């Protein structure tokens, strides 16, 4: 009906604007902001370019084909539009596959969160991705290797008013495997390992940076004490000069209340070392430390770092339950203390770690780990949007009558909307948030 055409036109127009303005904002943020110029952000630029080309040259011509119920652009632009459409989908999943592999080599290296590729090498990878995917998309379509031999297809090719994607059963299987399924199986398997390595490689140093935080300026403790860096207490006295005196002496320099990232790490490596030293000295804490595994030993050091050797020793009943490998009974007594009431969010994480003996409580807490979850959402959404289309595409090869034309176009458009979702998912990263609000002048 008339109301269904007007309504569809408005919706389709807003989808185009969201994809164009959205991906324009992403590319501009990376190109101007110095901190956003990383190897990982170079692959995101490749992904944003494909979504922008999709919203300017693919989605507009596809919208006109639905509203007019005919093709008014000829047979040359039909085959060229189809070639660009495929190239955009092929390059996007292969770019997401390269990110999964690069993030694996980085997490398994001593650099931990830095790509082993240079900015010059990454530029070559992105260029190779587009050149190779450009050949597998344009050549089988322009050479007419895709064309079906049935009468309904031959008539559509000859007609200048028909641009319906009719393919031979050989092309539909070969082009789906190499363009979509091959990078998808690799991307899923490789990135499931990246999430595994990150959780497994968590230590006491990463644990306390989550609980205590990192501040290079003298701040106020939850108990009103003077603190600097990763939970390093300066003094109990309410004197900023005495707090500056304890800081200026410990480093042996003119601090003036401000310290560097290299200086804060130097103090932390000494505090953790002293926390382990205190346990071996204490006769009540030492036999508990020996009966605990690697994960649970870190949970005890965390308590000593916070409350002190004498403080933790006061949990006479809880320490006994930990020594007898009774985790849930120790957990109830630890909850019934002033420690749980002072820092509930921190104590909840330490007590759960004593119960499970895993890093389940510190899941995606670290800033470097949150960046891995963000990339994981991008890969997940892309799979959720394009999988129903490619599955129905393979089912159509087995049995032709089961899938209707109206079902095919609807599933293809779910994949089209995905080109406008990626810029919204980049708002998870604080670096992009500050860049987006600057470009929008907010
Ligand atoms: C529709 C077709 C014809 C257009 C294809 C656009 C091509 C030329 C685009 C898409 C993605 C682009 C790349 C995206 C990311 C970067 C990182 C930057 O540090 C240097 C340029 C480089 C490597 C771009 C070069 C050009 C590129 C390969
Ligand atoms: C029409 C093609 C529009 C696509 C042209 C955009 C490609 C250029 C680009 O994205 O720029 C990357 C920038 O140099 C990163 O530092
Ligand atoms: C198959 C997919 C291969 C994708 C190519 C990515 C190459 C890469 O990530 O580099 C490896 C390492 O960083 C270099 O020492
Ligand atoms: C409505 C808002 C979306 C429109 C966003 C349009 C994208 C414009 C981005 C912009 O403001 O450009 C900055 C300019 O390049 C100076 O460095
Ligand atoms: C018709 C095409 C309309 C819009 C696409 C061009 C986007 C213009 C923004 C570029 C200017 C800039 O870098 O800030
Ligand atoms: C999410 C999907 C968003 C919009 C869907 C718009 C596409 C219209 C397809 C209708 C099917 C048809 O009439 O042929
Ligand atoms: C309507 C048509 C022009 N849209 C094409 C899709 O959005 C992209 O789908 C595809 C992408 C890559 C390979 C493929 C092989 C066979 C069939 C479809 C493929």
UniProtKB/Swiss-Prot annotation:
Lipidation (S-palmitoyl cysteine): 365, 441
Post-translational modification: Palmitoylated. Mainly palmitoylated at Cys-441. Palmitoylation may reduce accessibility of phosphorylation sites by anchoring the receptor to the plasma membrane. Also undergoes transient, ligand-induced palmitoylation at Cys-365 probably by ZDHHC9, ZDHHC14 and ZDHHC18 within the Golgi. Palmitoylation at Cys-365 requires phosphorylation by PKA and receptor internalization and stabilizes the receptor. Could be depalmitoylated by LYPLA1 at the plasma membrane. Phosphorylated by PKA and BARK upon agonist stimulation, which mediates homologous desensitization of the receptor. PKA-mediated phosphorylation seems to facilitate phosphorylation by BARK.
Taxonomic path: Eukaryota, Metazoa, Chordata, Craniata, Vertebrata
Disulfide bonds: 78-163, 156-162
Any one biological process term the GO annotation gives: positive regulation of lipophagy
Segments on the Extracellular side according to the record's topology features: 68-78, 147-168, 399-405
Binding site for (S)-carazolol: 85, 175, 412
Effect of residue 113 to F: Abolishes insulin-induced tyrosine phosphorylation and insulin-induced receptor supersensitization
Chain positions recorded as (S)-timolol binding sites: 85, 90, 393, 412, 416
Localization per Swiss-Prot or TrEMBL: Cell membrane; Early endosome; Golgi apparatus
Protein name: Beta-2 adrenergic receptor
Membrane topology: Multi-pass membrane protein
Membrane-spanning segments: 7-30, 44-67, 79-101, 123-146, 169-192, 375-398, 406-429
Keywords, alphabetical: Cell membrane, Disulfide bond, Endosome, G-protein coupled receptor, Glycoprotein, Golgi apparatus, Hydroxylation, Lipoprotein, Membrane, Palmitate, Phosphoprotein, Receptor, Transducer, Transmembrane, Transmembrane helix, Ubl conjugation
Phenotypic consequence of residue 441 to G: Uncoupled receptor
Keyword Lyase set for record: no
Gene from which this protein is expressed: ADRB2
Coverage span on the entire protein: 29 to 342 of 413
Subunit-structure text: Binds NHERF1 and GPRASP1. Interacts with ARRB1 and ARRB2. Interacts with SRC. Interacts with USP20 and USP33. Interacts with VHL; the interaction, which is increased on hydroxylation of ADRB2, ubiquitinates ADRB2 leading to its degradation. Interacts with EGLN3; the interaction hydroxylates ADRB2 facilitating VHL-E3 ligase-mediated ubiquitination. Interacts (via PDZ-binding motif) with SNX27 (via PDZ domain); the interaction is required when endocytosed to prevent degradation in lysosomes and promote recycling to the plasma membrane. Interacts with CNIH4. Interacts with ARRDC3.
GO molecular function, a single term: norepinephrine binding
Keyword Nucleotidyltransferase recorded: no
Primary location group: membrane
GO cellular component assignments: apical plasma membrane; ciliary basal body; cilium; clathrin-coated endocytic vesicle membrane; early endosome; endosome; endosome membrane; Golgi apparatus
Function: Beta-adrenergic receptors mediate the catecholamine-induced activation of adenylate cyclase through the action of G proteins. The beta-2-adrenergic receptor binds epinephrine with an approximately 30-fold greater affinity than it does norepinephrine.
Family recorded in the similarity comment: Belongs to the G-protein coupled receptor 1 family. Adrenergic receptor subfamily. ADRB2 sub-subfamily.
């Amino acid at each position: 009906d008339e109301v269904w055409v007007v309504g569809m036109g408005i919706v389709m127009s807003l989808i185009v604007l969201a994809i164009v303005f959205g991906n324009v904002l992403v590319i501009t943020a990376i190109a101007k902001f110095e901190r956003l110029q990383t190897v990982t952000n170079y692959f995101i630029t490749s992904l944003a370019c494909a979504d922008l080309v999709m919203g300017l040259a693919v989605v507009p011509f596809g919208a006109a084909h639905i509203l007019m119920k005919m093709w008014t652009f000829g047979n040359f632009w039909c085959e060229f539009w189809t070639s660009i459409d495929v190239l955009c989908v092929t390059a996007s999943i292969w770019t997401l596959c390269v990110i999964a592999v690069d993030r694996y080599f980085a997490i398994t290296s001593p650099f931990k969160y830095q790509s082993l590729l240079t900015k010059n090498k990454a530029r070559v990878i992105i260029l190779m991705v587009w050149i190779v995917s450009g050949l597998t998309s344009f050549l089988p379509i322009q050479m007419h290797w895709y064309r079906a031999t049935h009468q309904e297809a031959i008539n559509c090719y000859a007609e200048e008013t028909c641009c319906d994607f009719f393919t031979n059963q050989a092309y539909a299987i070969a082009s789906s495997i190499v363009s979509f399924y091959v990078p998808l199986v690799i991307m899923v398997f490789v990135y499931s390992r990246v999430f595994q390595e990150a959780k497994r490689q968590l230590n006491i140093f990463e644990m306390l940076r989550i609980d205590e935080g990192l501040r290079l300026k003298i701040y106020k403790d939850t108990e009103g004490y003077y603190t600097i860096g990763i939970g390093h207490l300066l003094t109990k006295s309410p004197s900023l000069n005495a707090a500056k005196s304890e800081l200026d002496k410990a480093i042996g320099r003119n601090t003036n209340g401000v310290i560097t990232k290299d200086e804060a790490e130097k103090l932390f490596n000494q505090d953790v070392d002293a926390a382990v030293r205190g346990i071996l000295r204490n006769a009540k804490l030492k036999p508990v430390y020996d009966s605990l595994d690697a994960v649970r030993r870190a949970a005890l050091i965390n308590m000593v770092f916070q409350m002190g050797e004498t403080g933790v020793a006061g949990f006479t009943n809880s320490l006994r339950m930990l020594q007898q490998k009774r985790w849930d009974e120790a957990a109830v007594n630890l909850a019934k203390s002033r420690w749980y009431n002072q820092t509930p969010n921190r104590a909840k994480r330490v007590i759960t770690t004593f119960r499970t003996g895993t890093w389940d409580a510190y899941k995606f807490c670290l800033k470097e780990h949150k960046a891995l979850k963000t990339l994981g959402i991008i890969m997940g959404t892309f799979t959720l949007c394009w999988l129903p289309f490619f599955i129905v595409n393979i089912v159509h090869v087995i049995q032709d009558n089961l899938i209707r034309k109206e079902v095919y176009i609807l599933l293809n458009w779910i994949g089209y909307v995905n080109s406008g979702f990626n810029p919204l998912i980049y708002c998870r990263s604080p670096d992009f948030r500050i860049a987006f609000q600057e470009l929008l002048c907010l």
